[PDB]
Design a protein around this ligand. Structure first.
Ligand SMILES: CC(=O)O[C@H]1[C@H](C)[C@H](O)[C@H](C)[C@@H](O)[C@@H]([C@H](C)OC(=O)C(C)(C)CC(=O)O)CC/C=C(/C)C(=O)Nc2cc(O)c3c4c(c(C)c(O)c3c2O)O[C@](C)(O/C=C/[C@H](O[C@H]2C[C@@H]3OCO[C@@H]3[C@@H](C)O2)[C@H]1C)C4=O
Lengths: 85, 113, 1112
DNA sequence: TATAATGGGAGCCTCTGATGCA
DNA sequence: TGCATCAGAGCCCAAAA
């Protein structure tokens, strides 16, 4: 499902974090912080680890994503090339 | 005439369908990579179904899925529903779309710069 | 000073609350302040009732919803990039139909964005407006068939996305066809499914002789309603097995299901009224007692046949009539997206009621709100109707909220729109402004709500009229839709009255928009005002009756672009709307009740009311709007002042003592000046800068993130490799520029280091570093700097780290720093000015005061406007405005001249005469006589027929002064202008287009990833686009080498552009170019398409443009 | 790795040329 | 064979974002 492939077990942890955070938001009446998720996840989890897990789980965005105006510009057109001098 | 049917499908050089880290450390990537990925997945699954001797219904569904996947890569939307990324109505941009139109390679970067 | 108001028209009612179209729509949609049992079925409430109950023996039912209080106040949300929103909860009871077990719980559905007091939203920290959308009203319409005359098409249109369109046609073969999702069949088949028999159809449609036989089909009548339903399903759905339960489900969902098919509430009324029936609901048919029961089709078929035969009383519908076009306001649009998300949430619920435990299930376990949160989040962030708020000045936002768009989802595209929709319909009178629309491609698609118009509950725009009975004008006002307006004869608002009685023998009125002269006995209603025909922007243009509409359009639109000035003043000629705009805008601050002012500060005002309670009003000071203009409120009262309810406390931006101030009042001379005024350019006096007229404050926001990397952390630090203490001088210990520092292009705002790319120590750099004996640092200088052309004074810094109270950033971001930089902008050459009549021009010359044309008594003029701009434009209001402005300059007064009931020439002449006494009589007493140069001008003036020959010089000068002309001395020579020149006070605004913002240049810079061509836009340091049409120009000139440079050395030729730079810095001429990289991209892209592209020499041998790199 | 489970789900303009029809 | 029907082809520039 992911452009950046993730090991099946790591996807399981990400999905667990989603379920956990969604549960926490349903009792708390607001989105939980990183610290609250670490509690809900049990031993081994601190706030730093929840954040690192969310970073790995970010999916890329299309270079062809339209930018305002009309059908006139692409997101990739605004990205400089740092490799070629 | 038989060259109008493809056996080996070319793969565009990576820097022309880049995967780049943007400012935030986030990744931005060309739609072609997803179109290729669909193709590769279905092809590999086809190889597996063949080796395991699946019934013709399974092989036919897979083969027709494979044709559609090549179709999306070369000219998406030309025949059948345009392939889209999940949770977006935006058709993915295929090779034909890149070449042609006001935003295409010829008019945008070639006859003007 | 005195304010003298003209006009005899007494307006019986004030303008409505101007943002009510926004505020009231959303208030009605959320119903947050209504206790749940008292909510009507509308907005979110109606959405809930529609989605629930969610059936299978598990059944989930909706009880009630509630909205909590916002987690953060509005100001706080803007600070923290938060959405201003409330938690939404819903009370749900789960029932097991088998067991009877009931578990009931209140599930949290996420947040819903709240509208602020002024009708806008805060979405991720930015203020947004939801624009109303015009569209075709649901209902049943009858239009002429363009191909075959005497025939008609019946179109049944529901709300967008709430059902298919149906077209009823009588085919050339004679059978009546129904079109649904592009398929046609004989309508008779569908009629049979409803349980109709030949007897009923014969008696109903028999009256129309030849048509009823086209409905008669023996084969269709042969099959029973059950057989006909299966047959139709096979016609509409090839392949899908025509199971009887399957067919009913499909047709039910398509026609009779109120969940899958919704005519509007306006749709229901329009159908009931057109066909003269009553609908039991919003569906085309019903499922009752096991079969299908018709609702619409027979009445719609009956009207269609009666029309084709030409039976009197059946008409075609004008589809651009504002009776058939309705507005979808904020509430309706948001609720629509809410309804979509709710339907999606139900899919998850139904899917979870199977795969789960039949014993342990709560409503919290059954409901996933993610689909709902996403639909609302999608609407507010990415919808086309959700726009970045226009808050250049207070009128901008008031106008934005009152705008009507025909674009957006569920509406016209821009290329697919022909003349009919963009037209000004006769029914726009009093409803949509005929003036205020874009000049560009969108003309007629984007419009503005008229000043007195309000949208009723069905979504139709209504406008007020006064009842006139017998001949007496009542004070009772009736708001009418366009359809109801067409019934009566409505007199114009200026028709003479003595008391409440009509005083004219013949009056000017409208019947169905057609103007007609009529006796007072025939007058049923009368206009409330002239104001009701035009938008709020158009109503701010004095002497509008004297301006050609094409120029009034630009005048309206440009007031939106007016920049708040530090010395801003209200115009010397107002229309009488300028107080109301500021008050409804909510920019200005007023007193709640009667009281006495306790404290007055730059930052705050304390008021003691009747209750004795002490209320404190804080003031917004130098806040940056979306467009970067400074919004700041200034206290207009002093300690101990007694104020009444509604008295002004503080002025908002672009307001003066509570009046809208979009500009300055300047002394203008209308005359050519040595071509610096040429083709709409403007010449101004340096005196304007000296006294800080047209000076405006602007604030830019700069932002930088320090994030975790796989190469190590970015750090925001004052320690930056290879920088002098001179370079770091204005940075504090932590690396952020100090508040109050002046920053110029190139200056560091926030110091930041980034860990060097893993390749980093080049061997060349290793040896160089070794020679100087300095270890190459691990980090590189990534500091945020001032871009070219920007800079100012640092007024604010915000720093947010990770691990500090109240702050959590997006994943990976350690800390975020924001620096707000302000600049005081004096008017300069290239800045854009405009008046309210559509006169606009850029400042081309600033003369020193001694060069400015001046009056005999030494007063120099401020602005010189070229007269060549008037005659082609036909906007004369600016001329009358200048004349009345002259009188007011000497009389020390300002005027209110209402639109179409204004100051007329005779009245303006009287004021000009009283003014001449002050301009001249003063002089005669001071011991000065007529000037020699005034005599020469009088001579030339008498040759022109301006003055009467033989009168004394004083008498002649007064004759000219009543014409708004004076003697003017050229400050360069001292000699007079050979003729009398029009001089007076004009209201001129400094618009949002300023050269400082637009000036840009690039030698070399960033290139794009794939094409290697320069990036675009000033913000990226982009190059200009030399497009197809530019190449043609070079081709037509035969400039082959100039063009080749554009295509190679100056763009994507990598070797060429590199070699050219090196040559220029060495003093050599630029080398011959190489292959443009984007052609190589084209070649490889054609190879990816299984096409072989080969470059050949004259011998047809391959030429390799990849120089061996791509071949094995 | 084992109760049994067996067919989906949705929608908003003009010219030119090939294709399918008396 | 001469007429209709539909699929597919296009629909301003630069600027901005
Ligand atoms: C990012 C953003 O806020 O820009 C927004 C928004 C217009 C502006 O920023 C800003 C509020 C602007 O109104 C004022 C400002 C001073 O601007 C100007 O002076 C100029 C001259 C530049 C105006 C111009 O020339 O464009 C001036 C207003 C004055 C006038 C006479 C006016 O009536 N103009 C105007 C111009 C438009 O083109 C559209 C438009 C549209 C709809 C439904 C509209 O009603 C439009 C509209 O009314 O459908 C289209 C295809 O596309 C829509 C694209 C964008 O919408 C976003 C909305 C969301 O934002 C992120 O995802 C979403 C996505 C949909 O894009 C537009 C709608 C589209 O063309």
């Amino acid at each position: 499902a992911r452009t950046i492939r993730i090991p099946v077990h790591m996807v399981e942890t990400i999905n667990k974090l989603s379920r956990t955070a969604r549960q926490l938001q349903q009792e708390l009446g607001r989105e939980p912080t990183y610290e609250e998720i670490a509690e809900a996840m049990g031993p081994g989890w601190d706030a730093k680890r929840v954040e690192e897990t969310l970073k790995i789980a970010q999916e890329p965005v299309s270079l062809e994503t339209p930018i305002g105006d009309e059908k006139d510009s692409f997101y990739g057109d605004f990205i400089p090339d740092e490799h070629l001098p | 005439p038989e060259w109008m049917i493809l056996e080996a499908v070319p793969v565009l050089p990576p820097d022309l369908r880049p995967m780049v880290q943007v400012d935030g450390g986030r990744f931005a990537t060309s739609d072609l990579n997803d179109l290729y990925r669909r193709l590769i997945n279905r092809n590999n699954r086809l190889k597996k179904l063949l080796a395991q001797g699946a019934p013709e219904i399974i092989i036919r569904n897979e083969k027709r899925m494979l044709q559609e996947a090549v179709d999306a890569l070369l000219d998406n939307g030309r025949r059948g529903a345009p392939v889209t990324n999940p949770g977006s109505d935006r058709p993915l941009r295929s090779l034909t779309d890149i070449l042609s139109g006001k935003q295409g390679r010829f008019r945008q970067n070639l006859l003007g710069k | 000073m005195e304010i003298k108001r003209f006009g005899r028209i007494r307006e019986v009612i004030p303008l409505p609350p101007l943002t009510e179209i926004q505020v009231e729509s959303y208030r009605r949609a959320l119903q947050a302040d209504v206790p749940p049992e008292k909510r009507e079925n509308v907005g979110i409430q109606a959405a809930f009732r529609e989605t629930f109950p969610i059936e299978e023996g598990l059944v989930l039912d909706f009880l009630e919803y509630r909205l909590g209080e916002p987690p953060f106040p509005q100001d706080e949300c803007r600070e923290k990039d938060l959405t201003y929103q409330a938690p939404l909860y819903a009370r749900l009871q789960l029932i097991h139909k088998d067991t009877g077990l009931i578990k009931e719980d209140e599930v949290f559905l996420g947040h819903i964005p709240l509208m602020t007091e002024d009708g806008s939203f805060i979405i991720n920290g930015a203020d947004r407006v939801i624009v109303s959308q015009i569209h075709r009203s649901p209902g049943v319409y009858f239009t002429p068939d363009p191909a075959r005359p005497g025939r008609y098409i019946a179109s049944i249109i529901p709300l967008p996305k709430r059902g298919p369109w149906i077209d009823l046609e009588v085919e050339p073969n004679g059978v009546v066809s129904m079109k649904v999702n592009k398929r046609k069949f004989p309508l008779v088949l569908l009629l049979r499914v409803l349980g109709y028999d030949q007897e009923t159809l014969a008696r109903e449609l028999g009256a129309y002789g030849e048509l009823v036989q086209g409905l008669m089909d023996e084969s269709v009548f042969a099959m029973r309603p059950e057989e006909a339903l299966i047959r139709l399903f096979t016609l509409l759905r090839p392949g899908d097995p025509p199971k009887r339960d399957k067919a009913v489900a499909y047709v039910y969902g398509l026609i009779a299901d109120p969940r899958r098919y919704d005519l509007g509430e306006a749709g229901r009324y329009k159908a009931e009224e057109k066909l003269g029936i009553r609908l039991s609901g919003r569906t085309l048919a019903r499922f009752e007692d096991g079969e299908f029961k018709d609702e619409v089709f027979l009445p719609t078929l009956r009207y269609l046949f009666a029309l084709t035969a030409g039976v009197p009383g059946h008409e075609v519908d004008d589809i651009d009539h504002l009776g058939n076009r309705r507005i979808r306001t904020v509430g309706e649009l948001m609720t629509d997206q809410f309804r979509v998300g709710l339907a999606r949430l139900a899919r998850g619920v139904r899917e979870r009621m199977l795969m789960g435990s039949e014993d342990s299930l709560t409503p919290a376990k059954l409901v996933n709100s993610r689909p709902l949160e996403a639909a609302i989040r999608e609407f507010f962030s990415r919808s086309q109707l959700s726009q970045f708020k226009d808050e250049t000045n207070p009128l901008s936002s008031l106008r934005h909220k009152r705008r009507i768009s025909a674009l957006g989802p569920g509406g016209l595209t821009r290329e697919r729109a022909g003349f009919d929709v963009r037209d000004v319909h006769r029914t726009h009178y009093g409803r949509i402004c005929p003036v205020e629309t874009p000049e560009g491609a969108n003309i007629g698609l984007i419009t503005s709500l008229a000043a007195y118009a309000r949208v009723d509950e069905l979504g139709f725009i209504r406008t007020p009229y006064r009842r006139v009975v017998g001949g007496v004008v009542t004070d009772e006002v009736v708001y009418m839709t366009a359809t109801e307006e067409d019934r009566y004869t409505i007199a114009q608002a200026n028709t003479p009255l003595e008391g409440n009685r009509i005083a004219a023998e013949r009056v000017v009125a409208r019947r169905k928009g057609e103007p007609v002269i009529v006796s007072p006995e025939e007058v049923e209603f009368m206009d409330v005002s002239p104001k009701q025909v035009f938008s709020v922007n158009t109503n701010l243009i004095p002497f509008l009756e004297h301006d050609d509409a094409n120029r009034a359009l630009m005048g309206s639109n440009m007031q939106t672009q007016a920049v708040p000035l530090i010395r801003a003043q209200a115009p010397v000629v107002m229309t009488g709307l300028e107080e109301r705009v500021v008050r409804d805008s909510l920019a200005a601050l007023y007193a709640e009740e009667d009281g006495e002012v306790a404290k007055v500060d730059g930052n705050r005002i304390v008021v003691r009311y009747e209750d004795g309670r002490l209320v404190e009003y804080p003031l917004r000071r130098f806040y940056r709007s979306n467009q970067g203009t400074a919004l700041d409120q200034r206290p207009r009262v002093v300690v101990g002042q007694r104020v009444r309810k509604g008295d002004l406390l503080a002025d908002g931006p672009a307001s003066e003592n509570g009046f809208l101030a979009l500009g300055q009042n300047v002394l203008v001379a209308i005359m050519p000046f040595d071509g610096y005024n040429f083709e709409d350019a403007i010449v101004i006096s340096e005196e304007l800068l000296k006294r800080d007229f047209y000076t405006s404050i602007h604030i830019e926001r700069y932002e930088i993130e320090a994030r975790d990397t796989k190469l190590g952390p970015e750090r925001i630090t004052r320690d930056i490799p290879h920088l002098s203490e001179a370079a770091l001088r204005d940075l504090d210990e932590e690396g952020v520029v100090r508040i109050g520092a002046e920053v110029k292009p190139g200056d560091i705002l926030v110091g930041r280091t980034s860990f060097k790319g893993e390749s980093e120590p080049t061997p060349e750099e290793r040896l160089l570093r070794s020679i100087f004996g300095e270890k190459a640092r691990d980090v590189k200088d990534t500091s945020l700097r001032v871009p070219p052309g920007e800079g100012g004074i640092v007024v604010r810094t915000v720093r947010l780290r990770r691990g500090d109270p109240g702050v959590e950033l997006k994943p990976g971001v350690r800390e975020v720093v924001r620096v707000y930089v302000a600049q005081k902008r004096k008017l300069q050459v290239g800045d854009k000015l405009a008046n309210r009549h559509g006169n606009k021009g850029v400042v081309a010359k600033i003369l020193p005061v001694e060069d400015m044309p001046h009056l005999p008594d030494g007063t120099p003029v401020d602005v010189i406007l070229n007269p060549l701009g008037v005659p082609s434009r036909m906007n004369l209001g600016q001329i009358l405005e200048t004349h009345l402005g002259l009188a007011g300059y000497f009389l020390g007064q300002r005027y209110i001249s209402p639109i179409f009931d204004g100051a007329k020439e005779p009245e303006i002449k009287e004021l000009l005469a009283q003014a001449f006494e002050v301009y001249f009589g003063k002089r005669k007493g001071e011991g000065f006589g007529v000037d020699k140069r005034e005599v020469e001008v009088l001579r030339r003036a008498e040759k022109l027929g301006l003055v009467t020959p033989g009168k004394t010089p004083e008498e002649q000068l007064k004759e000219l002064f009543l014409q708004g002309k004076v003697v003017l001395y050229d400050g360069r020579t001292g000699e007079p202008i050979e003729g009398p020149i029009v001089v007076g006070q004009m209201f001129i605004m400094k618009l949002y287009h300023m050269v400082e913002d637009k000036m840009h240049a690039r030698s070399t810079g960033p290139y794009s990833l794939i094409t290697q061509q320069p990036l675009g836009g000033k913000a990226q340091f982009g190059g200009q686009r030399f497009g197809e049409m530019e190449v043609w120009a070079l081709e037509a000139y035969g400039a082959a080498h100039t063009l080749q440079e554009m295509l190679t050395l100056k763009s994507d030729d990598i070797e060429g552009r590199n070699a050219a730079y090196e040559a220029i810095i060495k003093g050599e001429d630029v080398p011959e170019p190489s292959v443009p990289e984007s052609f190589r991209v084209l070649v490889k892209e054609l190879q990816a398409l299984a096409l072989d592209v080969q470059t050949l020499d004259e011998k047809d041998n391959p030429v390799d443009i990849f120089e061996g790199l791509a071949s094995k």
